Amino acid sequence: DSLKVTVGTANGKPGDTVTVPVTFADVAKMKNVGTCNFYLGYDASLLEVVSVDAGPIVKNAAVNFSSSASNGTISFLFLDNTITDELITADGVFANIKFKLKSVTAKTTTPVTFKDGGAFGDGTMSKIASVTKTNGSVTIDP
Amino acid sequence: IVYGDYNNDGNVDALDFAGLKKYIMAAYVKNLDVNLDNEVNSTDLAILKKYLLGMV
Ligand SMILES: [Ca+2]
Ligand SMILES: [Ca+2]
């Protein structure tokens, strides 16, 4: 029925670096993923992104996976540059985002959200029309 | 008349990126020549890549 793309969660204390996963599910059901781009929002007064790394489901990430983070937006772009041979075919972690936690006076949960934009292409690079996006978060506990 | 809009759907997104990659691996398509140099090649793909990563 739909591709599930879910931002997970993490927690720590100010100064901690935490990892927030971005997970795909029902991949085969949707005929695999050949390409995708999407955009996540985060509160830049509470989180700073340290790094964004491809997860286990992305083959040949050095060639096929890119990301960028600036002032509260993280961008992701994946393409199987072989077109047929390095597709996303498995459910699992597409990306891992590392955030460094900034200071708070009281325990706070802050969202990591999908922003409007981008598209997902299946194993033939055709639009996947139904994509169920789930927002995640980080909990900062002083 | 929308640069980058490979499949003409009113959005410039990964579907277009994939379509452009396939195209270059295979003529002249005006809206794929995003640097207006009268060629569609890997430079246009690279420009679209950077655009998508800077878009929002
Ligand atoms: Ca398009
Ligand atoms: Ca060109």
TrEMBL record, chain A:
Subcellular location: Secreted
The name this protein goes by in its record: Scaffolding protein
UniProt source species: Ruminiclostridium cellulolyticum
